[PDB]
Amino acid sequence: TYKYVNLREPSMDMKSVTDRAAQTLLWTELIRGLGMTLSYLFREPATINYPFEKGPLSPRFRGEHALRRYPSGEERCIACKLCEAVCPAQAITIEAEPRADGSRRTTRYDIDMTKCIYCGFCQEACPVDAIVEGPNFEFSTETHEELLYNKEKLLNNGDKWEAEIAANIQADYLYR
Amino acid sequence: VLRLVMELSGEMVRKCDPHIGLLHRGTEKLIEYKTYLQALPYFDRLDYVSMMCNEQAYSLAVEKLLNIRPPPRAQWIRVLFGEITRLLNHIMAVTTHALDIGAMTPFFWMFEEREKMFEFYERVSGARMHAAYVRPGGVHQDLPLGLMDDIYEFSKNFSLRIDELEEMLTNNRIWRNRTVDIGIVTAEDALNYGFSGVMLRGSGIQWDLRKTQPYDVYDQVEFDVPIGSRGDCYDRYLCRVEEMRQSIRIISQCLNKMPPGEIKVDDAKVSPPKRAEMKTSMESLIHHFKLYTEGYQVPPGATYTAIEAPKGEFGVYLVSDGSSRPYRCKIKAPGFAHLAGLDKMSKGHMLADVVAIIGTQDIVFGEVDR
Amino acid sequence: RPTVRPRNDVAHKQLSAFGEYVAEILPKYVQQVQVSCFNELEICIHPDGVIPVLTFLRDHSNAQFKSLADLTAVDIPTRQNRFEIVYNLLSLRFNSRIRVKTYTDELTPIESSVPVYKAANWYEREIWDMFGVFFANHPDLRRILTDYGFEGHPFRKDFPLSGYVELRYDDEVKRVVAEPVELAQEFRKFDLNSPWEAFPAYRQPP
Amino acid sequence: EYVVAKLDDLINWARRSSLWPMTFGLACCAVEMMHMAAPRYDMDRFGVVFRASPRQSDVMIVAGTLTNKMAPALRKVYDQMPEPRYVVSMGSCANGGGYYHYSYSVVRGCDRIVPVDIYVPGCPPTAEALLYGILQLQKKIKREKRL
Amino acid sequence: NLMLALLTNFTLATLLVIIAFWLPQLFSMKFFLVAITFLLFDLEIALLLPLPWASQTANLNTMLTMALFLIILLAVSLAYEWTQKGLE
Amino acid sequence: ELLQVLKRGLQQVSGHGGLRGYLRVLFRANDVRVGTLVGEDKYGNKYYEDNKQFFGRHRWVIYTTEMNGKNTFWDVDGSMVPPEWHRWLHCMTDDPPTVKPPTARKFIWTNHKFNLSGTPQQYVPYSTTRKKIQEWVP
Amino acid sequence: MINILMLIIPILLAVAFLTLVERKVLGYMQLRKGPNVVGPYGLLQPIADAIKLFIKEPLRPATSSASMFILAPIMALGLALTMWIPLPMPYPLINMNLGVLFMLAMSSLAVYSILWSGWASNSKYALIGALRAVAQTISYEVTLAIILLSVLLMSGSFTLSTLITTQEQMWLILPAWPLAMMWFISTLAETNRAPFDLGPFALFFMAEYANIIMMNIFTAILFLGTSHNPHMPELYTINFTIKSLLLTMSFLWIRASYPRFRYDQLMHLLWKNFLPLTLALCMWHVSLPILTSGIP
Amino acid sequence: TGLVGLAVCETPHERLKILYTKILDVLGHIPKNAAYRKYTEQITNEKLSMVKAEPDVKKLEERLQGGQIEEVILQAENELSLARKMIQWKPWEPLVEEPPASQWKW
Amino acid sequence: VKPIFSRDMNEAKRRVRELYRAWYREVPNTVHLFQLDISVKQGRDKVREMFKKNAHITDPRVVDLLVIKGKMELEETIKVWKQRTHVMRFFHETEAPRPKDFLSKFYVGHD
Numbered sequence A: 001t002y003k004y005v006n007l008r009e010p011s012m013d014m015k016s017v018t019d020r021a022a023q024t025l026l027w028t029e030l031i032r033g034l035g036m037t038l039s040y041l042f043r044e045p046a047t048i049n050y051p052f053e054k055g056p057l058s059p060r061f062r063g064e065h066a067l068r069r070y071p072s073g074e075e076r077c078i079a080c081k082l083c084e085a086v087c088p089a090q091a092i093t094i095e096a097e098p099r100a101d102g103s104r105r106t107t108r109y110d111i112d113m114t115k116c117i118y119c120g121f122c123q124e125a126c127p128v129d130a131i132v133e134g135p136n137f138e139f140s141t142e143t144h145e146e147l148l149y150n151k152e153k154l155l156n157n158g159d160k161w162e163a164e165i166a167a168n169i170q171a172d173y174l175y176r
Numbered sequence B: 001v002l003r004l005v006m007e008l009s010g011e012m013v014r015k016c017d018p019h020i021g022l023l024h025r026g027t028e029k030l031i032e033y034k035t036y037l038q039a040l041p042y043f044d045r046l047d048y049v050s051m052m053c054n055e056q057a058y059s060l061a062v063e064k065l066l067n068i069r070p071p072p073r074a075q076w077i078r079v080l081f082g083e084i085t086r087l088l089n090h091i092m093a094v095t096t097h098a099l100d101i102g103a104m105t106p107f108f109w110m111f112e113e114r115e116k117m118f119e120f121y122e123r124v125s126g127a128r129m130h131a132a133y134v135r136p137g138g139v140h141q142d143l144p145l146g147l148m149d150d151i152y153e154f155s156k157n158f159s160l161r162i163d164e165l166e167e168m169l170t171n172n173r174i175w176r177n178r179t180v181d182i183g184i185v186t187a188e189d190a191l192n193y194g195f196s197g198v199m200l201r202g203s204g205i206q207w208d209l210r211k212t213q214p215y216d217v218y219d220q221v222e223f224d225v226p227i228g229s230r231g232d233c234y235d236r237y238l239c240r241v242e243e244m245r246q247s248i249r250i251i252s253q254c255l256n257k258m259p260p261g262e263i264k265v266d267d268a269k270v271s272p273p274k275r276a277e278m279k280t281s282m283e284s285l286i287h288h289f290k291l292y293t294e295g296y297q298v299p300p301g302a303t304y305t306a307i308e309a310p311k312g313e314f315g316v317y318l319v320s321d322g323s324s325r326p327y328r329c330k331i332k333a334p335g336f337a338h339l340a341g342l343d344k345m346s347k348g349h350m351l352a353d354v355v356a357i358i359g360t361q362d363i364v365f366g367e368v369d370r
Numbered sequence C: 001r002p003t004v005r006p007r008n009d010v011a012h013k014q015l016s017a018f019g020e021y022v023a024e025i026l027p028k029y030v031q032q033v034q035v036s037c038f039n040e041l042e043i044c045i046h047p048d049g050v051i052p053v054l055t056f057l058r059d060h061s062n063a064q065f066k067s068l069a070d071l072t073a074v075d076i077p078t079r080q081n082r083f084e085i086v087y088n089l090l091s092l093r094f095n096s097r098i099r100v101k102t103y104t105d106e107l108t109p110i111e112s113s114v115p116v117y118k119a120a121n122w123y124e125r126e127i128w129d130m131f132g133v134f135f136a137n138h139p140d141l142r143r144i145l146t147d148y149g150f151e152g153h154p155f156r157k158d159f160p161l162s163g164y165v166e167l168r169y170d171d172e173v174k175r176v177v178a179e180p181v182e183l184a185q186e187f188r189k190f191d192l193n194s195p196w197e198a199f200p201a202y203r204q205p206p
Numbered sequence D: 001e002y003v004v005a006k007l008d009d010l011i012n013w014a015r016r017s018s019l020w021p022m023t024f025g026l027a028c029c030a031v032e033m034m035h036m037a038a039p040r041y042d043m044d045r046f047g048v049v050f051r052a053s054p055r056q057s058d059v060m061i062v063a064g065t066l067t068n069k070m071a072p073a074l075r076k077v078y079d080q081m082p083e084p085r086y087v088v089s090m091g092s093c094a095n096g097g098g099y100y101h102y103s104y105s106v107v108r109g110c111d112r113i114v115p116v117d118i119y120v121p122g123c124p125p126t127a128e129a130l131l132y133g134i135l136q137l138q139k140k141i142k143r144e145k146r147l
Numbered sequence E: 001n002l003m004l005a006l007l008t009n010f011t012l013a014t015l016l017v018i019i020a021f022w023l024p025q026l027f028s029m030k031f032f033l034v035a036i037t038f039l040l041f042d043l044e045i046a047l048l049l050p051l052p053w054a055s056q057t058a059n060l061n062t063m064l065t066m067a068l069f070l071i072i073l074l075a076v077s078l079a080y081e082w083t084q085k086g087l088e
Numbered sequence F: 001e002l003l004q005v006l007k008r009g010l011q012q013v014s015g016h017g018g019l020r021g022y023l024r025v026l027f028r029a030n031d032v033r034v035g036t037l038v039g040e041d042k043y044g045n046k047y048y049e050d051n052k053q054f055f056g057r058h059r060w061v062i063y064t065t066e067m068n069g070k071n072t073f074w075d076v077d078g079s080m081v082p083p084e085w086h087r088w089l090h091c092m093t094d095d096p097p098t099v100k101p102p103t104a105r106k107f108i109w110t111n112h113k114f115n116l117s118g119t120p121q122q123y124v125p126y127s128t129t130r131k132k133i134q135e136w137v138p
Numbered sequence G: 001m002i003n004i005l006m007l008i009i010p011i012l013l014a015v016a017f018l019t020l021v022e023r024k025v026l027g028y029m030q031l032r033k034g035p036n037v038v039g040p041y042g043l044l045q046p047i048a049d050a051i052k053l054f055i056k057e058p059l060r061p062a063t064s065s066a067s068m069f070i071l072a073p074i075m076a077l078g079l080a081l082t083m084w085i086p087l088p089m090p091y092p093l094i095n096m097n098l099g100v101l102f103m104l105a106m107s108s109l110a111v112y113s114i115l116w117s118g119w120a121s122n123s124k125y126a127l128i129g130a131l132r133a134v135a136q137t138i139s140y141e142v143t144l145a146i147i148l149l150s151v152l153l154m155s156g157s158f159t160l161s162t163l164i165t166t167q168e169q170m171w172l173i174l175p176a177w178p179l180a181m182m183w184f185i186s187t188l189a190e191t192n193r194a195p196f197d198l199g200p201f202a203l204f205f206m207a208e209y210a211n212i213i214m215m216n217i218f219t220a221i222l223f224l225g226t227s228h229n230p231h232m233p234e235l236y237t238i239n240f241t242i243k244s245l246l247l248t249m250s251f252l253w254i255r256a257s258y259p260r261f262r263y264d265q266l267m268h269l270l271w272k273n274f275l276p277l278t279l280a281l282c283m284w285h286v287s288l289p290i291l292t293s294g295i296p
Numbered sequence H: 001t002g003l004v005g006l007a008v009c010e011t012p013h014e015r016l017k018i019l020y021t022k023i024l025d026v027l028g029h030i031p032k033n034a035a036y037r038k039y040t041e042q043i044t045n046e047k048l049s050m051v052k053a054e055p056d057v058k059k060l061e062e063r064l065q066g067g068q069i070e071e072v073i074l075q076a077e078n079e080l081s082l083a084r085k086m087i088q089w090k091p092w093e094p095l096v097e098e099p100p101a102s103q104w105k106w
Numbered sequence I: 001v002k003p004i005f006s007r008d009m010n011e012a013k014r015r016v017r018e019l020y021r022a023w024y025r026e027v028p029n030t031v032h033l034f035q036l037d038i039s040v041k042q043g044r045d046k047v048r049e050m051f052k053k054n055a056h057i058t059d060p061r062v063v064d065l066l067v068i069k070g071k072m073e074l075e076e077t078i079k080v081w082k083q084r085t086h087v088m089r090f091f092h093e094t095e096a097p098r099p100k101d102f103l104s105k106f107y108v109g110h111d
């Protein structure tokens, strides 16, 4: 398409030479460059202090994993190994056994945070919508053991975020 | 980050052999075991700056294997997000380059604007930076109603924001003092290194992939390619800013032309069907069960695709079996090409010039892997 | 077809002319097999002369390629000859992409592409790193992506993904970072391979 | 008796005021670490100063992926650090290899090289979540040297 | 007193060093040419130092020709620095 | 023009508290700002909004004094605030106690919990399988 | 004699409270918020940096050669604090027989502070970069002496008290128009890290930032003045501080706005270009008291 | 006027004519039965006729180059090196090398 | 012949001899320049045990590839390269190490 970066001799004779020499003799353009930051100082900065103010987000955002449940009790996860095979990090492990009598829903359910690159693939591959990614930021531990999620339990403890998840999924069915 | 073994005759460099590869993650052998849908987020996490420009090269490579065109709507999203990465990369091609020199303001001036850019990414996909958004089935998820009004709202204020850098950096004597006359290489020997993005494009040859080889609805969108004259660091910087001023033209034309329709490929042997669709009908859920876990069942054959990166190219070379696992591929990032140039670029230059060479070539260490 | 087909074949017959033109020279030294599919050309080359093939396409009156840019290699243990070094070439004046392949096992040294192409030496180091293919008459063959205390070649399908030396402890010794420890976490080997043949025409008779 | 308990908190307040981290550009995480400088989400001069320097810095953030080539390289940086040192493993790669992990080159855990006090789980570790890592570090400093 | 003023600054400077020290318990010859020219110019500065304090009683016409003379030769020494100084 | 800028600061200090109220928004809080407040949340959380100021900003909000058992006012992280993070805090337009109501299912926890941290009663890993059984008896 | 302690303790606080100014004023230039969490506006942070580095932070020397390394900060802090003594102000502490000669002398000896630090490290890796840092300071001191003399030859003797009296109606910026531009650049060479950049390590910060205020004040004597007023010391004290503070903003302006000039081209700005310019103006300033009567 | 590349745009005519006449003789030294000589000669003769007909016109440079005479001169400069390497190493004239093992399908 | 490699049978043996001298001279040099680590005498014993595992010699093709590799992993010290007593260390420091016996290995129970 061509645009050209080269100026091809801005100075020609007398008048065009002197002003190109004036900027190199003293400064001028450095004083003009000083004025750029000068007005930039006066205008209000966009700063957010975290313990009081919070930054912008979205209805669909992936953070720490938490598995959802039905409104009338019952664990929504059905045990498929579907999310296990899609997982590109292989962070999720699943071994399933029959629950007492009749029902067949999970036994072993570990999601590694040492692994997991956060895709929302396990959210997408799930037909029952068990793992739904909630707006999470707060996670800090002393050990790997405290960081990697155990057999559901702490994932089921996502009830504190499941109220937000139920609100966020209402913006998810028939996507946006 | 970089080791850089130096040979100095007094003060200036004689031999500059970059002993690099300190971030070889080992994607080569690792993708061999993963399926096509499983291998997707590796490409985003290859380069540190480009997100939607990555996967774009990978998805089209699978699309050239499957011989299946993405829907007409999804292709327009791909350009809208392909040009938004051309904004993201060319911000970092200026800011960290200036930060490596010693300039403090232009980094923080743009990163206010760049943080507003990840609001688009968060509203369109889960995570902030890397997204499993561009897929072999076109585009994973449609744009929400809020975003399309925000793109126009951002672009209106953007033209003044980018022009603030030109009255700050290009006009000043410092840049005409520092970056001028560092490694003026434009000959047939410069062509013997193969940079594609900038360098050859920035100075000398009028060749570009955007005009010559269309990817997803091209030539229909009006493009402007900046080509300089001298192969120095300053003219190779000017073209990047001239790319940025002549990039909103594409984004505005993306907003002008948007046909409503399909988001994924309607054929359910490539892309998983809708969530409301899979719960009721039978064939949808079985295909959902087999597009996940099991891969794609790809046609066998060796294919090479290269889509213009703001750094250079992503020369993905997928070799395929009958099985769902792609056996070996190589991502040909320009990191191998740019660091090879330092054998000629450093000839008769100071230690401070070397830092300016890396910045103008934009060697972000994530590039060098394959 | 509207969404099912990517592109109709129109330049396929035009690119097939290259499949004849280079083959019209007809060397047993160079040509062998010419494959053309999906707007792309693929040539495999006899090990004895690789440099004379690379001097061709460079310059030349009919087609001007010049850039012998990107350089890959294929690891496959099915054939009697193991490795397959693949050259990806691009033209700026002509605007076309052609492929150069090698068929030899190349555990025994192969001719270098350094005198023809300048950036080829950096890619040649990677092939010696990952695959272990030595290039004859090569200037500066140095390790890049491999570790300084690394044994073997990291890509070869003969050994596991985890390796032999990978885990690096600190523990008892004050300064020396450990190496001999070999254990890692279990990578789950997926046996997902679909019954029934995926595509017709690709089926080969036993 | 009362002065002894209150003076200990005053020394802990000095680290609660300001923390100087190491700028390791070894990741995609490092670009999110540059978003700590980006005005919208700031700990800059709230505690964080981007001057870094190998010797003067109190905190070192291990950004993302570490290879066996960088394993002896990052270890000697840790030895140059002063005695009150805190190591943040920001990113899933730093926690135990988010991706790769089973790969030959990538070191698993980071704790095999350098011990970690604060773990941040996020791949693209959102600047909102990154703000916790510094705030938790300030909260974790409670009591030092009783006798 | 000048002696009392100077010694107070140094004694407080020494005390600041002990605080950090005692309390806690648990090649290229091209640089040389620049350095030499510094010394040779400063001696011409040393001869040109008296000017504002000297020119009060002495005749101006006798001084004018001699005062400029040192600065002219100070430029001639810099004129020899233009005929290939080096890469520095 | 000059008089209106000084008068605006005086109205902000007089509105929120006074002599003791303004000091709580200066010493404990990073930035002092006055506007409309919802004032309906679990524990001692206020969560204010409606203020213009800048794009992607929803007032001071303010951290809770003694959320569950921390008993801290000087130092507090984002462990506080009940299910409202995806609401008026960042994502949604409607306020949690004003327009958009939280859905009841009797599965979600009634009392909000703070971060685990290095403190006792925190996160832990656990075994799942009953394993292969082996027994020997006389 | 109690006034000496009233010119070290508030001065050490001024170097400490610079940490607010050096990243909040610099912050608004870069659209970032500086100190805010630590204090009401971050006023508790400058004193908090002192508790961090002095008491708790331990030492790990490279070799520690008997006397050195624990002698270089004494030369750094000592020479920076002694520069405050000859300063004219409203009234000077122990006024020297000649003022500016003491000012140029203690600055030329302040080159040793970066010299002994290079000798402290046993490695060859550090001393090459250390000598390069000496070259940044040693070269600009040649011109610094010339531009000083041209101002003095216009009016007044070497005494700093006489320089206030000569500026009664108009500032010295107007007669010395190109010379005033030189003092904005030449002062930045002495470890200001704006045109070029290279326990006890913390003590160097307290000495290097002290010289920044020192050059701001010294420029406000040679070029600024406005009024004297011997009867009213109240009017001079307030008016002098505002003039010095405006020059402190310009020192932090160059640090944020402009990139490094390269070490080689630092010797192309000076020596090649500045030294012919400064001496030509020095030639002009010899003729000025002879052309028109101007002798103190 | 100057070209964008490092190669200097020098006003020289018949310079292209000398190099294109030189390469024709080199091709007629060793290979005669080979197709390499038979195919390259007819392209060069087609290009030489355009130079003789058009006197220093930009349209002559636009034919099969379109990047001025400087780019066309580089095509002739490496043509002599390519012809000499083809004459030294026998590949076009002789074909007798061994065939590959029977495997191609992935 | 095919394929060339570098040397033919007898010539390949003398290339190992030239390689042996270059590495024997570096082990006293890599104590003062590098680190003390273990010993100068013990470092020379590490050389002999390395060549014993490589000692087979059936074809010059295998021998020639060992020379190129031998001029790389043992070259990681001559031209001064960073290792920091972690890379180029061949001997196990933390090895148990296991023994081959039907009484020693069977007591621990492996495989």
Ligand SMILES: NC(=O)c1ccc[n+]([C@@H]2O[C@H](COP(=O)([O-])OP(=O)(O)OC[C@H]3O[C@@H](n4cnc5c(N)ncnc54)[C@H](OP(=O)(O)O)[C@@H]3O)[C@@H](O)[C@H]2O)c1
Binding pocket: none
């Ligand atoms: N080379 C030799 O000196 C030598 C020679 C022959 C035998 N040994 C044997 O080897 C051992 C060497 O150990 P070491 O001297 O190296 O150990 P050490 O450095 O004294 O460390 C012991 C740690 O345990 C804690 N501790 C011990 N008793 C405690 C108490 N009553 N209350 C609270 N904290 C307590 C201390 O913590 P606080 O500091 O916080 O209280 C201290 O950090 C000795 O036990 C000795 O029998 C040594």
Ligand code: SF4
Binding pocket: A076, A077, A078, A079, A080, A081, A082, A083, A084, A094, A125, A126, A127, A128, A129, A130, A131
């Ligand atoms: S999370 Fe969903 S896909 Fe995974 S096992 Fe449970 S129900 Fe199946």
Ligand code: SF4
Binding pocket: A086, A087, A088, A089, A090, A091, A092, A111, A115, A116, A117, A118, A119, A120, A121, A122, A123
């Ligand atoms: S987000 Fe991705 S990596 Fe994490 S558990 Fe889900 S599928 Fe696996």
Ligand code: SF4
Binding pocket: A117, B045, D027, D028, D029, D063, D064, D065, D090, D091, D092, D093, D094, D098, D099, D122, D123, D124, D125
């Ligand atoms: S955790 Fe994610 S963002 Fe961070 S380095 Fe790893 S792949 Fe990159």
